[PDB]
Ligand binder design. Structure first.
Ligand SMILES: N[C@@H](c1ccccc1)P(=O)(O)O
Ligand SMILES: [Co+2]
Ligand SMILES: [Co+2]
Ligand SMILES: [K+]
Length: 304
């Protein structure tokens, strides 16, 4: 395999971490290839669940706890910390909240969160590499509680970063937030990519095509598929009671991605940097409720 940049995996990985049996597990947790029967049973469906009130309470709770766990990871970000160390803390923090770390064995993903450094677009696997001054790192958290998943991510600065890193991360965040600000009933899901790409391109960045935002609730990934680029053909129209993510990945160079031999780590084909933010959203009537928002502080961690 020819790496696209400077980053390399740092093996070996620690033995997978067990989750105590008192924590409720999603279907894929014990499937030998980590396949989710319940997702496979709706594969290729465009229909979007309208959440009951009970479903809404369930999502509020899991997304709140997911934010708490992300905040834990955010407090650990500094030079010399490894991504495995971050994942270990996340793993214990999920268990402390009586939640299952959704990534763990999802289609055999080996860890409890995703750590994506520099040219990694998403789904980086926590490993023995220590964070370096000047890196940007995304941590993606997903928790499962009482049958519901809640999903968010942020990109962080490790020490001081260069102006390009600052502008990439800020623009990405603005892309997310401009998309969220358009969410309300009657808006087509395919419109969000128009908005995101417009802002990205205005600042000289590209928008990853291969990965999309998604419905989420009882399933981790389900309808709708929510592309982040312009002139996409996503199916469906927002309605009160819909729950889904928006998670744009924006890049300094070209948009094209490829995957490491591990089967997960997605990297820019050009080796330039990519950044991401993600929220889980509920469509209401005034608009939308950001289920994964911070409750105690105005801004994402990178500003703070
Ligand atoms: N949280 C994410 C995830 C976790 C684990 C495995 C695959 C994707 P994504 O849906 O945001 O890409
Ligand atoms: Co995520
Ligand atoms: Co997601
Ligand atoms: K990245």
């Amino acid at each position: 395999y020819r790496y696209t940049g400077k980053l390399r995996p740092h093996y070996p990985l620690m033995p997978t971490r067990p989750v105590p049996s008192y924590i409720q597990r999603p279907d894929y947790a014990d499937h030998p290839l980590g396949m989710s029967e319940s997702e496979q049973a709706l594969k290729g469906t465009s229909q979007i669940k309208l959440l009951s009130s009970e479903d809404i309470e369930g999502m509020r709770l899991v997304c709140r706890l997911a934010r708490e766990v992300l905040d834990v990871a955010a407090g650990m970000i500094k030079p010399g910390v490894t991504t495995e160390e971050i994942d270990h803390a996340v793993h214990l923090a999920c268990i402390a909240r009586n939640c299952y770390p959704s990534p763990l064995n999802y289609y055999n993903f080996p860890k409890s969160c995703c750590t994506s450094v520099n040219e990694v677009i998403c789904h980086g696997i926590p490993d023995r590499r220590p964070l370096q001054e000047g890196d940007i790192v995304n941590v993606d958290i997903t928790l499962y509680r009482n049958g519901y998943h809640g999903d968010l991510n942020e990109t962080f600065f490790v020490g001081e970063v260069d102006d390009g890193a600052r502008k990439l991360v800020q623009t990405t965040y603005e892309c997310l937030m401009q998309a969220i600000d358009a969410v309300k009933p009657g808006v087509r899901y395919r419109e969000l990519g128009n908005i995101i790409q417009k802002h990205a391109q205005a600042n000289g960045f590209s928008v990853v095509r291969s990965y999309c935002g998604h419905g989420i609730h009882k399933l981790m990934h389900t309808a709708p598929n929510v592309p982040h680029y312009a002139k996409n053909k996503a199916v469906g129209v927002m309605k009160s009671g819909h729950v889904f993510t928006i998670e744009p990945m924006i890049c300094e160079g070209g948009w094209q991605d490829e995957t490491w031999p591990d089967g997960w780590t997605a990297v820019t084909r050009d080796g330039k940097r990519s950044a991401q933010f993600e929220h889980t959203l509920l469509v209401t009537d005034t608009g939308c409720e950001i289920l994964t928002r911070r409750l105690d502080s105005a801004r994402p961690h990178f500003m703070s």
